[PDB]
Amino acid sequence: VFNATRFASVYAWNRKRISNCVADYSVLYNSASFSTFKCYGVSPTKLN
Amino acid sequence: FNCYFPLQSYGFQPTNGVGYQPYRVVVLSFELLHAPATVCGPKKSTNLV
């Protein structure tokens, strides 16, 4: 999703379901390759 | 980059809702039967027997 080859339009926004696996978010918070990162209700690093 | 100023202000204005308007809070704490008394209430003492 974050590194997709060709994204979709805005009216044609794609959705990808994720489940039954582990998700390492700490690598994203420390990636330093994003213009903005905002999490509502929960801290970004507390997602782990 | 991942650094934030923890101090933020309140939106106390005359147009916001009661969920945001300023509420003058006054928290009264005290200890009871822990030391000799200093404060008392509007009472009337009397003689001894």
Curated annotation (Swiss-Prot), chain A:
Result when mutating residue 6 to T: In strain: Omicron/BQ.1.1, Omicron/XBB.1.5, Omicron/EG.5.1
Residue positions the entry lists as glycosylated: 3
Impact reported for residue 3 to Q: Reduced viral infectivity
Consequence recorded when altering residue 33 to P: In strain: Omicron/BA.1, Omicron/BA.2, Omicron/BA.2.12.1, Omicron/BA.2.75, Omicron/BA.4, Omicron/BA.5, Omicron/BQ.1.1, Omicron/XBB.1.5, Omicron/EG.5.1
Quaternary state and interactors: Binds to host ACE2. RBD also interacts with the N-linked glycan on 'Asn-90' of ACE2. Cleavage of S generates a polybasic C-terminal sequence on S1 that binds to host Neuropilin-1 (NRP1) and Neuropilin-2 (NRP2) receptors. Interacts with host integrin alpha-5/beta-1 (ITGA5:ITGB1) and with ACE2 in complex with integrin alpha-5/beta-1 (ITGA5:ITGB1). May interact via cytoplasmic c-terminus with M protein. May interact (via N-terminus) with host bilirubin and biliverdin, thereby preventing antibody binding to the SARS-CoV-2 spike NTD via an allosteric mechanism.
Record's function text: Attaches the virion to the cell membrane by interacting with host receptor, initiating the infection. The major receptor is host ACE2. When S2/S2' has been cleaved, binding to the receptor triggers direct fusion at the cell membrane. When S2/S2' has not been cleaved, binding to the receptor results in internalization of the virus by endocytosis using host TFRC and GRM2 and leading to fusion of the virion membrane with the host endosomal membrane. Alternatively, may use NRP1/NRP2 and integrin as entry receptors.
Protein name: Spike protein S1
Covered range of the whole protein: 341 to 388 of 1273
